Swiss-Prot record, chain A:
GO biological process, one term: maturation of SSU-rRNA from tricistronic rRNA transcript (SSU-rRNA, 5.8S rRNA, LSU-rRNA)
This protein's name: Small ribosomal subunit protein eS1A
Post-translational note: N-terminally acetylated by acetyltransferase NatA.
Chain's role: Component of the ribosome, a large ribonucleoprotein complex responsible for the synthesis of proteins in the cell. The small ribosomal subunit (SSU) binds messenger RNAs (mRNAs) and translates the encoded message by selecting cognate aminoacyl-transfer RNA (tRNA) molecules. The large subunit (LSU) contains the ribosomal catalytic site termed the peptidyl transferase center (PTC), which catalyzes the formation of peptide bonds, thereby polymerizing the amino acids delivered by tRNAs into a polypeptide chain.
Cell compartment(s), UniProt: Cytoplasm
Swiss-Prot record, chain B:
Oligomeric and partner information: Interacts with KRR1.
Function description: Required for pre-rRNA processing and 40S ribosomal subunit assembly. Seems to act in the processing of 35S rRNA at the A(0), A(1), and A(2) cleavage sites.
Protein name: Protein FAF1
Protein's cellular compartments: Nucleus, Nucleolus
From Swiss-Prot, chain C:
Keywords, alphabetical: Nucleus, Ribonucleoprotein, Ribosome biogenesis, RNA-binding, rRNA processing
Listed name of the protein: KRR1 small subunit processome component
More info: Present with 4340 molecules/cell in log phase SD medium.
Parent-protein start and end of this portion: 35 to 264 of 316
Subcellular location: Nucleus, Nucleolus
Organism in which the protein naturally occurs: Saccharomyces cerevisiae (strain ATCC 204508 / S288c)
From Swiss-Prot, chain D:
Species the sequence originates in: Saccharomyces cerevisiae (strain ATCC 204508 / S288c) (Baker's yeast)
Subunit structure and binding partners: Component of the small ribosomal subunit (SSU). Mature yeast ribosomes consist of a small (40S) and a large (60S) subunit. The 40S small subunit contains 1 molecule of ribosomal RNA (18S rRNA) and 33 different proteins (encoded by 57 genes). The large 60S subunit contains 3 rRNA molecules (25S, 5.8S and 5S rRNA) and 46 different proteins (encoded by 81 genes). uS11 interacts with eS1 forming part of the mRNA exit tunnel. uS11 interacts with snoRNA U3. uS11 interacts with MPP10. Component of the ribosomal small subunit (SSU) processome composed of at least 40 protein subunits and snoRNA U3.
Location, primary (coarse class): cytoplasm
Localization of this protein: Cytoplasm; Nucleus, Nucleolus
UniProt PTM comment: N-terminally acetylated by acetyltransferase NatA.
GO cellular component, one term: nucleolus
Note: Present with 29600 molecules/cell in log phase SD medium. There are 2 genes for uS11 in yeast.
Gene Ontology biological-process annotations: cytoplasmic translation; maturation of SSU-rRNA from tricistronic rRNA transcript (SSU-rRNA, 5.8S rRNA, LSU-rRNA); ribosomal small subunit assembly; translation
Domain of life the protein comes from: Eukaryota
Annotated protein name in UniProt: Small ribosomal subunit protein uS11A
UniProt keyword Metal-binding present: no
Amino acid sequence: GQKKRVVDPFTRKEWFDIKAPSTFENRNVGKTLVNKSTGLKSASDALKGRVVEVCLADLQGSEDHSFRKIKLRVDEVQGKNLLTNFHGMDFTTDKLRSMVRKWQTLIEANVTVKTSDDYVLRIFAIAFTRKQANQVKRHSYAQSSHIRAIRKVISEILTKEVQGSTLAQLTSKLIPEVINKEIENATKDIFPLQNIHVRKVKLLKQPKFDVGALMALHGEGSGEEKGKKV
Amino acid sequence: QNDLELQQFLRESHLLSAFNGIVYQDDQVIGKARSRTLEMRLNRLSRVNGHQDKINKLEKVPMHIRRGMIDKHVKRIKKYEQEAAEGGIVLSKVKKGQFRKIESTYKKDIERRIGGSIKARDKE
Amino acid sequence: FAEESSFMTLFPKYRESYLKTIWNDVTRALDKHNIACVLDLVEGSMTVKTTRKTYDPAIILKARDLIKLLARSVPFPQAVKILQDDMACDVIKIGNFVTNKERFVKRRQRLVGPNGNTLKALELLTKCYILVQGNTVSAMGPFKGLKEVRRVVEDCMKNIHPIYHIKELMIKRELAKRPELANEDWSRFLPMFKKRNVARKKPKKIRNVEKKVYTPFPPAQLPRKVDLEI
Amino acid sequence: SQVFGVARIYASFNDTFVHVTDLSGKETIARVTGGMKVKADRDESSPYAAMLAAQDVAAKCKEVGITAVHVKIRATGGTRTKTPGPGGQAALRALARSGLRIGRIEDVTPVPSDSTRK
RNA sequence: CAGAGGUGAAAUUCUUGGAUUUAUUGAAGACUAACUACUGCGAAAGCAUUUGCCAAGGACGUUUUCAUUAAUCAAGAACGACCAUAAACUAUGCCGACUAGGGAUCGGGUGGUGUUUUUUUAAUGACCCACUCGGCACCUUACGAGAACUGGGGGGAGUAUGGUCGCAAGGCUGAAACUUAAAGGAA
């Protein structure tokens, strides 16, 4: 039949940029389109649900976070800025495919923990059984009771690292990979365990908004702006 | 099972790949593939009614160089099937005294000189 | 250029005496594409990195495929045919098809063939390089050949024999090399359509309606003559 | 100085998709597939079709104001081939050759993680 | 915003009442990827996410206990009116009442005495080495009569046929009682 004639949809598009929370280094991550702020769907509520997936290397300046992408959820719009909060964390698939080798065991755990806020998080963990230096047998398997005990102490100490953190404290805790060092130190009594990682953090429920808490995560701001000159 | 062109292509797939889209049908097969293909077909036809001491005559090779040929070929076979066994690779299954037929078997024409199995040990 | 790309696979320990030998050829074959590569022999890994002089954006993906082919134990002159545009990998998964180990290994050995004939004829027809290893099937080749070998392997793990697919591949080659008959369907020429589903049980369902209810408690045993006398 | 979109190249067999969106993925900038550039209905996956689709993608991205793209290259995945078709590397090469800067190439095909086969 | 599947090409199909692609979220039914092995467990068919409960089982350790309670199998028992489905398909090997081994691996135990571990919260590892018991396999060795879901003709490769049973040729069709139209074929 008859279809449609085009009218260019980039004349009604508005550019915002995304300010990341201050639990990171350099916080301008990029820009985002949205339709122009008309009545009946204003743009500031056409936003506020969008998550962006950025790289932690791009958020932290280094390159040892070249894996480990994270998600930032848009919460509050002010003055052509999208202030975001932490929404999750995930490895790239190539990292854990680069970690998995045969002739070892992968012990993976996960716990659903509610923080010192009322965010509830499903937080994961992977760990691979190392072989010691001077080990001549090619296997280095765990005896599955060592797996249950390792997974037990993984669950206990990382649910101790949450509940004893807020979201900002947990994010600043898992940027420099130090919960992995806690797992390694707490587990070398059982098995050697190379390259423990957290690998995945999911938000499940989020409490309320608390604009004051978000603006204290970012920085202040209030405007009296221009005035019309007639 | 009673397709002739299909089964001929199946059992002459090895030396077609050794001496090569590809050609497989006669009236398109150029030299060394043609000679060994025709010789393989004539051997397989003549192994029914011809005598077993008269169908597969080995080329006369001296003792101290045929035994070295066999030892180096078995070293190749053991290295190949050991490398495949420590990899995942599923190999085709041979009988107990036979030599495993590999790419050097098809290229080097080694079975005319060494046979398919040591028939003294097969006899005993 | 690009920012940075870095892939890494990690290889099993027995491969290192081969990879140490062929490794200078890998550096030649990748430095003609301006890709660095390290071979770590202590952690047992192979990494490829996009350097400052890489103007081909997509070649780091083929370098990734090359090093995981080297890890999956294809040889070097076979595996450097992945650095060219007309050729790619596929890793068919055959483990999740059938239940018992006997039927699994018999269908996988059927995929290999007597003396390797089925596999070598498949490599010849599809112009691919196929490795039946473990409970998966690696393959390198052109994309039409990869589509063909994937359908061959999956239907071989289902019950239909692979020499039917080899026959229809020969039929399709000698049917594609004529200028006419190239927009007509070849289903009358292919013998693959068997119509072998031609049984239907038609009993009266005497016991099969509802017989032999299950009780968890066993019956007692017929006692011996000694028991019957004492 | 760069403005970053993402590339979202989905390169199956039988077709390729070059679909730049913004950094979130909610707003699209010039989805053009392979089968809409030149269609013999079988050359949809071809490197020529992927180069044409990525070239007028990069035209509209330079029109809107995007200078660089983060490349997310996926295959059909699922319970299927997991290997990108012939159009993925061609679309990536044409996106780089037509002015756009490339960053963060990553492979986001859906590995099915215990699938629904039998 | 105009195509998407799919194919060797196509097609049935979906699609401007927005398909395919992208992002957020929900629901459903399965399934337990890589780790995954000539490894483990189970009487066999079989069994792979976490945690808990319920009973079970095996090997080892034992200066515990009972005291011949035992081994094999015909018979018999346990396991194995709606929506409609595949199995085999190239294979292998010399058997048992039978001697020693060798490397690797799984579970337990003993000893050694180094490194990872570590400390006055409980107990508890991992690796290396030797020995030992029991397993799944593999590579070899030495030595023995090892005899006394039922229905079957007689080797393989061929050759001939004045026998018996069949199937099959001719010759332009129309068109025969009719030297007969139209039309078609052939050359």
